[PDB]
Structure formats: C-alpha cells, structure tokens
Amino acid sequence: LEVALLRDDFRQNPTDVVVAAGEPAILECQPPRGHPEPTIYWKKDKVRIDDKEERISIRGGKLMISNTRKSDAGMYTCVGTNMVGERDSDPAELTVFERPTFLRRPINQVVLEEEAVEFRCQVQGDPQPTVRWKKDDADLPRGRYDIKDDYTLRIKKTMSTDEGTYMCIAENRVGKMEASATLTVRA
C-alpha cells in the first residue's frame, strides 16, 4: 500500500554543456519522485533518442555523447516516466564549438636588407578565432609592422634586427593553436 504518484519537480535537471567538437558530452538527470519509481529517457529537440550508435550511451541518469559533432547541438530534455505519466525536465542546451585551425600557415621568408616582406595567417573556428602575432615569444617591436585587414604582417624596409621566429596565434573560447615561421635577413 504505497500511493500511485508522480511529482513535477526533477530531483536533478540536466544543465547546459559546452564542448569542442571531438570532446565527449555528458548530461545528467534524476527524475521527480513517484511510485512506482520513474524511469527516464531522453529527447533531442523534442524527438526521443536511443543508444543505437556506438558513440551514444544511455545508462543510469546519464546520457553520454562521445565524439561530439556540430549536429549533436540542440536542446536536450530528460523525461521521467511511470504508470501515472510522463514529466519533462527543464532542457539543457548542448553547444558544439570548433577549436581553431589554420587555413593558411605563415611560411619561412628569406629577404635581403631594405626591401618588403609579408607574412600570412588565415584561421578557422567557431567562434571565429582571435589572431595574435609574436616575435621570439615576445611582442612585435614598434614602428616596423604594417597590418592589413586579414591578419597579414607587412614590412616596407626590412633590417637585420628584424631577424627571428614570428608566431601566429589563433584563439577562441575552446582552444588555441600556434604556427611560427623564420625571417632571415642578408647583407
């Protein structure tokens, strides 16, 4: 003699998850109290899903998504079920971002004193990565460098002190990536 019952308040709602593509995502749910003890299943944008695919696993209170792809993003809902009815959790957004990569890596230059040189860096990612430039792991000297819109690093009248390793850094909220290239000067 226990009450046939289903509450409306989840013991644990799933919470939003932010991931870089390739990383795993884990959503957690505990259903409301009830009798009989509710089970759970999961919906993605109101459509019920299953653990058919190898990279998806549903067990306990967890939905586990290995090797996230941009497709995986959406609103995930946990549903608590028993013979009284179904209850929908507050939804959790899965965001899948893309760690920055290089469309165009900068390439070693070799140049004779007093004469133009340019270095190129084109990046991709989601969000769009912030591009930074360095020299010998320190800030670009003043006066010298001309800057196009695209992250092209330009010089009109090169000189010997300009010698060293020039690094392009691409950075968003989900990763960082470095690519450097030598500038060689000759009298």
Ligand code: NA
């Ligand atoms: Na599976």
